[PDB]
C-alpha cells in the first residue's frame, strides 16, 4: 500500500493506485491491484494497514452486491460513500479499528455526473475534484491546483495524471513500482493496460 490518487473530470472519474506491496526490506509484489468494484458504476481504491485493507474492501463489496441483488437496483455513488463512511465511523471507536483509507470513484446514472469521494480511516468524507491519501497529496495537490480544469476530457485527465506520477517518481523516497489506472464513466469501469 501507499499511493492512491483520484481525479474527477467532465465525464469520468480516474483512479490511480500503486502496484508495490512491500514487507520489511523486500518488495514482495509489483503488480498488486489495490481496488474493488462495488457495483458496475462504482469503484473503490484503498490503502493502509496490511490485511485490514483487503478485508475491509471485500466486506464493503459483499454488502453493496447484496443490496444490488435484493433491490434489483444500483446504489448511487453518494449513497455508497455514506454507507462506507458510517462503517469507518463505527470502526474508529471499536476494540480494533480498521486502519484503511479509501477513494470512491463513481458515475451517477440518474444525474449523468462523475463523482469522487475521499474517506479516511476516521470516517472523514469529502467530495472533491481531485483527491489523494497519505504522503501522495503533499506533491500532487499543489500540482493539480495549478493544472486542473473542471471541463477536462478523459484524455486530458490521463495526461494530468501522468504528470503527477512523474513528480512522485522523482521526489518520493520509496519505489512504488508504477500505478494501475482505472476509468469510471457512463459505460462502467475499465482498466488502462499501458501506463
Amino acid at each position: 500500500m501507499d499511493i492512491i490518487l483520484g481525479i474527477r473530470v467532465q465525464d469520468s472519474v480516474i483512479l490511480a493506485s500503486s502496484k508495490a506491496v512491500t514487507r520489511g526490506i523486500s518488495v514482495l509484489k509489483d503488480s498488486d491491484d489495490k481496488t474493488r468494484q462495488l457495483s458496475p458504476h462504482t469503484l473503490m481504491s484503498f490503502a493502509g494497514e496490511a490485511g485490514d485493507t483487503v478485508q475491509f474492501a471485500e466486506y464493503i463489496q459483499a454488502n453493496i452486491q447484496l443490496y444490488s441483488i435484493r433491490e434489483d437496483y444500483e446504489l448511487s455513488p453518494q449513497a455508497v460513500s455514506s454507507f462506507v463512511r458510517q462503517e469507518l465511523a463505527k470502526s474508529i471507536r471499536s476494540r480494533r479499528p480498521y486502519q484503511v483509507n479509501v477513494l470512491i470513484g463513481g458515475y451517477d446514472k440518474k444525474k449523468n455526473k462523475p463523482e469522487l469521494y475521499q474517506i479516511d480511516y476516521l470516517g472523514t468524507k469529502v467530495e472533491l475534484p481531485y483527491g489523494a491519501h497519505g504522503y501522495s497529496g503533499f506533491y500532487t495537490f499543489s500540482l493539480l491546483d495549478h493544472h486542473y480544469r473542471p471541463d477536462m476530457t478523459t484524455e486530458e485527465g490521463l495526461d494530468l495524471l501522468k504528470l503527477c506520477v512523474q513528480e512522485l517518481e522523482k521526489r518520493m523516497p520509496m519505489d512504488f513500482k508504477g500505478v494501475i489506472v482505472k476509468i469510471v464513466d457512463k459505460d462502467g469501469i475499465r482498466q488502462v493496460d499501458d501506463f
Binding site: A89, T124, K125, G137
Partner: protein, 204 residues
C-alpha cells in the same frame, strides 16, 4: 494526535436586535495539509441552526444523528423543535458518551418561533451548556475569536450591522490561526427569513 486539532476549523454565533447570526470557516485539513475548502460546519433542522467544530468525522456523525432525532421529534410532536429544547437534546446526547466522547465544540443558534426571542448556546465536548446573551465561540482559533468578539461586540445590532461585526470577528481570528480559514460562510437569521453569505478572505 490531539483529536480536536487534527482537522481544524471555527464557529462563532452572535445575537442582535430581533435576530441572530452564526458563521464558520470552510477549511478541512489533515494537520498541515489542507484537504478541502468546501467543508461547511453549520447545519439546520427546521429553523434551529447548529454549528460544530472539532474532529470532522464526529461533526458529520452528529449532524446525521441530530437530523435523525429532530425528524422523529417532529413526527411525534407534530411541530418543529425550538432552540431551547434542541440545546437540551444536544447536551443529553453528548453526555451519554461521557467516557468515550465525540471530540466536538457545538454551537446552537436560532429564534424561538413562539416568543420571538433570539437564542444562542455553546457546549464543551461532553455536554456542558454555555448560555450567553452576547456571543459564543468554538474551534482552534477560539482564543482569537474571544478577543475579537469581546472588543467588537455591542448589544442590539441591526441585521446589516451584525453581519459586519460577526464577519470581521471570524476573518481576523481565522488569519491568526494556521488550521482555520480557506473561505467562510455567515448566516443572518431573522424571524421568517434567513440569508447566507460567502465571504472573500485570504486563501493561505
Amino acid at each position: 494526535s490531539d483529536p480536536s486539532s487534527i482537522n481544524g476549523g471555527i464557529v462563532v454565533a452572535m445575537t442582535g436586535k430581533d435576530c441572530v447570526a452564526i458563521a464558520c470557516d470552510l477549511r478541512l485539513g489533515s494537520q498541515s495539509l489542507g484537504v478541502s475548502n468546501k467543508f461547511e460546519k453549520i447545519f439546520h433542522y427546521g429553523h434551529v441552526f447548529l454549528g460544530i467544530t472539532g474532529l470532522a468525522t464526529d461533526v458529520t456523525t452528529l449532524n446525521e444523528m441530530f437530523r435523525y432525532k429532530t425528524n422523529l421529534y417532529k413526527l411525534k410532536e407534530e411541530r418543529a423543535i425550538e432552540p431551547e429544547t434542541f440545546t437540551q437534546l444536544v447536551s443529553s446526547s453528548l453526555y451519554e458518551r461521557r467516557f468515550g466522547p465525540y471530540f466536538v465544540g457545538p454551537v446552537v443558534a436560532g429564534i424561538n418561533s413562539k416568543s420571538g426571542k433570539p437564542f444562542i448556546a455553546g457546549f464543551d465536548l461532553i455536554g456542558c451548556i454555555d448560555e450567553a446573551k452576547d456571543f459564543i465561540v468554538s474551534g482552534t482559533a477560539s482564543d482569537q475569536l474571544f478577543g475579537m468578539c469581546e472588543s467588537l461586540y455591542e448589544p442590539n445590532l441591526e441585521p446589516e450591522d451584525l453581519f459586519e461585526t460577526i464577519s470581521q470577528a471570524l476573518l481576523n481570528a481565522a488569519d491568526r490561526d494556521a488550521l482555520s480559514g480557506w473561505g467562510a460562510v455567515v448566516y443572518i437569521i431573522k424571524k421568517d427569513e434567513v440569508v447566507k453569505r460567502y465571504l472573500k478572505m485570504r486563501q493561505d
